[PDB]
Design a protein around this ligand. Structure first.
Ligand SMILES: Nc1nc2c(ncn2[C@@H]2O[C@H](COP(=O)(O)OP(=O)(O)O)[C@@H](O)[C@H]2O)c(=O)[nH]1
Ligand SMILES: [Mg+2]
Length: 165
């Protein structure tokens, strides 16, 4: 049995709260802004013959970039999220990465481009997202929380890397 605290980080409106609700509750609602009224949601899964309890902590956006918060404290893995339709959220990734490393150190991390169902309206070229992932040395996923596309894979990857580097 292992419990893993995972923090989901990135600019406002990229889909962090939706991603957590999708993974832990299996829902996607039509609201302009999602809310999680508790510190974290959780999902208990089996990974490589071990029982893992994933505790997914939501965060605030760039308006709280300098904030030192409970969601980051003792985080054991991290999802860095930007949005297909928000170039500023992509440009912010390196700053979010540096913030997490300075607060918790080196923890398993993945880079996620969410809202890939909106590719027609993309503001990020595929080559530049892949180039950033290679520069930060991070596994990169293109996700659609709305379509339940690659969400499960993100958390499974992080749990496996926590268990075996
Ligand atoms: N089309 C699309 N909309 C999404 C996706 N994920 C989230 N959204 C929407 O993006 C908006 C912001 O999502 P939210 O989870 O509140 O973002 P947060 O501010 O990062 O927590 C909401 O209207 C969500 O329904 C996605 O994969 N595709
Ligand atoms: Mg939110």
């Amino acid at each position: 049995e292992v419990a893993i605290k995972m923090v989901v980080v990135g600019n406002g409106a990229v889909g962090k709260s939706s991603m957590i609700q999708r993974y832990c509750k299996g829902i996607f609602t039509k609201d302009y802004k999602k809310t999680i009224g508790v510190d974290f949601l959780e999902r208990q899964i089996q990974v490589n013959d071990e029982d893992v309890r994933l505790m997914l902590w939501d965060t605030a956006g760039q308006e709280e970039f300098d904030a030192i918060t409970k969601a980051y404290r003792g985080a054991q893995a991290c999802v860095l999220v930007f949005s297909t339709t928000d170039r500023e959220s992509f440009e912010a990734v390196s700053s979010w990465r540096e913030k997490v490393v300075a607060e918790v150190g080196d923890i398993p991390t993945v880079l996620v481009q969410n809202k890939i169902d909106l590719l027609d309206d993309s503001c990020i070229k595929n080559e530049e997202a892949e180039a950033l992932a290679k520069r930060l040395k991070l596994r990169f996923y293109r996700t659609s929380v709305k379509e339940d596309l690659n969400v499960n894979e993100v958390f499974k990857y992080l749990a496996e890397k926590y268990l075996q580097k």
